[PDB]
């Protein structure tokens, strides 16, 4: 994850959007596979095929959320000509939440996901700008 | 490292995967636990013998002593599982889901 | 002191005790008694401390 | 030293106090079958402790000053009311049966505690092992619902498994028509309302279930009405029993110590008699229970732990 994460943050906002969508889609697909592995291991599928169906359904859903986010947030930065604005991640975050509602067929999950994915993504850009630490290194 | 360590570390990993991927018999998995102890004994014994760490030569012996206590404990529980259900199948041990 | 009215001294005594403890706190905060620029003066012939 | 693991280690072991005369005898039979008199004579001749049948107010007789409490502190369950209106709408029939089972459970623990701690045997009149005949009779007459029966069985399963059956089960076999005559001569107005079908159900359960069950694990002496009159001949029968069967032969000091730790802790004995299963017959609303519980604490010598009640003459409380 460390290398796939660096790729995303190492290519500037609005420059090489296609490359950005590769990285976020790659992150989303990895997350979907992890969810599938635990799901398949803890709730055994009725058959081998059904396990593959569940995996491909989670991994695609997760990759779609990652793809729409990384693209939309890059397009917003390019069009708005503001590569440092958290608002772009909010729009990208909400769009991903909307796609999650789409793949789930449920406007309510779509609405809630748009709000919390949008806010969470916006918080991520702010922390990147300001240097917020999630797993802060011990210093004192 | 030297090539022997490749196969001993491989053996430990194979037994570890064997332990973590249950089938039906509880005794099959208890065997994988004894295998894990065997690979640790060999890997510990090689390192200690190669380095001429004289006092550490007793350490592998102590490892086997507590390997047997673990094995005896595992078999004692297998007896009680067998008595309750008539087989040592692990799928019978699911009462504590609720 | 009666068997029927001794409970009516608990709160008055708590006030007296609390009043007393507050004054003892003021005795640990005398580092600037008669030392501030605004109120520093001389002691009257008979006086001991400006405020106790 | 109150009994515990420390007393066990220092030597207080059951096999020291238990002799060939340390037996648990239960006397059973139908209503007005002469159990009480036969039980009292057997106890006196064999030199055992006699336990009069456990009734509604048995528990009062063992705590406090040993006198019956007002009926609100037994749930208001009434045996007289059961005869007058066996199909009462306030669930008296089962509530009484559930209260009586718990009283028997407590008496059995007291009997076992006496037997294990002193070695002197005991004589009971019915027990937890034979209490179900009344429940079966109640259900076949329609006095209680199938759910009451289910609740009774749930409580029995998790309670009767902890104890040992009696060494000797004495049964007095009085046929129903004779019993009806005996109940009729006795005189109390309410018991005269018992129907023969009810008494036949008690008899059918006694012979269809209790005795076949007890036989595999206890010595059973089945007497007729005439044989039972002379308690001396019954005592002679008990004195030459072989005692070759049942779970008592497998008991050791280790097991009887675990049993003693249970029967001496009455709250542990009664633990499952109040399982949270909400049958209307036995469920008490929070407002009623709160009121009754307050009144119970206002009785003489019940506010505090026994020995700390100054209202009834306890002294040295500030050092106790």
């Amino acid at each position: 994850a460390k290398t796939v994460l660096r790729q995303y943050w190492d290519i500037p906002e609005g420059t090489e959007c296609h490359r950005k969508t590769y990285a976020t889609t790659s992150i989303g697909g990895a997350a979907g596979l992890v969810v599938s592995a635990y799901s398949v291991a803890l709730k055994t599928p009725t058959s081998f095929l059904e396990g593959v169906a569940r995996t491909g359904r989670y991994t695609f859903t997760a990759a779609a959320i990652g793809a729409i986010f990384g693209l939309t947030s890059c397009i917003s930065a390019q069009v708005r000509e503001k590569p440092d604005d958290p608002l772009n991640y909010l729009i990208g975050g909400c769009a991903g939440g909307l796609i999650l509602g789409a793949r789930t067929r449920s406007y309510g999950i779509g609405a809630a996901a748009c709000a919390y994915m949008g806010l969470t993504a916006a918080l991520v850009k702010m922390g990147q700008l300001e240097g917020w630490q999630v797993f802060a290194e011990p210093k004192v | 490292m030297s090539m022997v360590y490749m196969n001993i570390m491989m053996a430990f990993t194979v037994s570890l995967v064997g332990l973590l991927m249950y089938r039906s018999h509880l005794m099959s998995s208890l065997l994988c636990l004894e295998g894990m102890m065997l690979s640790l004994f060999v890997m510990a014994a090689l390192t200690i013998l190669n380095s001429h760490f004289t006092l550490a030569s007793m350490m592998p012996i102590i490892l086997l002593v507590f390997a047997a206590c673990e094995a005896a404990l595992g078999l004692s529980l297998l007896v009680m599982v067998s008595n309750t259900y008539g087989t040592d199948y692990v799928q019978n041990l699911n009462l504590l889901q609720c | 002191v009666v068997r029927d009215h001794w409970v009516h001294v608990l709160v008055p005594m708590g006030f007296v005790f609390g009043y007393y403890l507050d004054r003892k706190n003021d005795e640990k905060l005398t580092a600037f008694r008669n030392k501030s620029l605004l109120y520093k003066r001389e002691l009257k012939p008979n006086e001991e401390v400006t405020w106790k | 030293l109150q009994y515990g693991p420390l007393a066990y280690i220092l030597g207080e072991k059951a096999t020291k106090k238990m002799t060939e005369k340390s037996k648990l005898i239960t006397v059973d039979g139908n209503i007005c079958s002469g159990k009480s008199k036969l039980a009292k004579e057997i106890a006196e001749k064999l030199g055992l402790k006699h336990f009069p049948e456990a009734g509604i107010h048995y528990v009062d007789s063992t705590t406090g000053d040993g006198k019956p409490l007002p009926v609100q502190f037994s749930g208001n369950c009434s045996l007289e009311k059961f005869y007058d209106d066996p199909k009462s709408n306030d669930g008296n029939s089962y509530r009484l049966q559930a209260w009586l089972y718990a009283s028997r459970l407590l008496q059995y623990a007291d009997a076992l505690e006496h037997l294990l701690s002193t070695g002197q045997g005991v004589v009971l009149e019915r027990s937890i092992y034979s209490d179900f005949v009344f429940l079966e009779a109640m259900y076949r007459q329609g006095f209680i619902r199938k759910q009451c029966v289910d609740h009774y069985n749930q409580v029995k399963k998790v309670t009767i498994c902890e104890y040992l059956p009696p060494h000797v089960v004495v049964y007095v076999d009085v046929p129903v028509p004779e019993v009806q005559s005996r109940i009729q001569k006795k005189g109390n107005p309410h018991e005269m309302k018992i129907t023969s079908a009810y008494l036949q159900d008690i008899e059918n359960a006694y012979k269809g279930t209790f005795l076949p069950e007890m036989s595999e694990k206890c010595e059973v002496l089945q007497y007729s009405a005439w044989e039972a009159q002379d308690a001396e001949k019954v005592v002679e029968d008990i004195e030459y029993l072989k005692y070759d069967k049942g779970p008592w032969l497998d008991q050791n000091d280790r097991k009887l110590h675990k049993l003693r730790m249970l029967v001496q802790d009455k709250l542990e004995v009664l633990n499952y008699t109040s399982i949270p299963v909400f049958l209307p017959e036995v469920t008490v609303g929070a407002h009623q229970s709160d009121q009754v519980f307050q009144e119970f604490t206002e009785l003489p010598g019940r506010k505090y732990r026994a020995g700390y009640n100054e209202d009834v003459g306890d002294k040295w409380i500030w050092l106790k």
């Binding site: - | - | - | 506010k303 505090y304 732990r305 700390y308 409380i317 500030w318 050092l319």
Partner: protein
């Protein structure tokens, strides 16, 4: 400082907690509360029953609490001693600054209009 020692010998150069320490009084009050809870759970007269038992609750709480406070005070003395000794050993890391008055320091004014 000393390995696996509750009160190293160097701690005796510090004053002991006074027996009228407010923290020790609170600890004693906790012992009193423990005594009352002991009576309550056993349905004994809460205030009156078993005064000897209540006394031992207070005394044992105070006894342990006195040594905890003695060790608590010692460990904070050690923290201060370590910190000041380190400041002496590395002056360049803790320079004494030149202090300027507010007449000299420029602070921006933000009107509340």
């Amino acid at each position: 400082r000393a390995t696996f020692q509750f009160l190293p010998d160097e701690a005796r150069s510090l004053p002991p907690p006074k027996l009228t320490d407010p923290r020790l009084a609170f600890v004693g009050f906790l012992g009193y509360c423990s005594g009352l809870i002991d009576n309550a759970i056993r349905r004994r007269p809460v205030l009156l029953a078993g005064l000897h038992r209540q006394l031992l609750y207070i005394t044992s709480f105070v006894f342990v609490g006195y040594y905890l406070l003695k060790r608590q005070d010692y460990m904070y003395a050690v923290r201060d001693h370590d910190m000041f000794s380190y400041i002496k050993s590395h002056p360049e890391d803790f320079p004494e600054k030149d202090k300027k008055t507010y007449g000299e320091v420029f602070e921006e004014f933000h009107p509340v209009r």
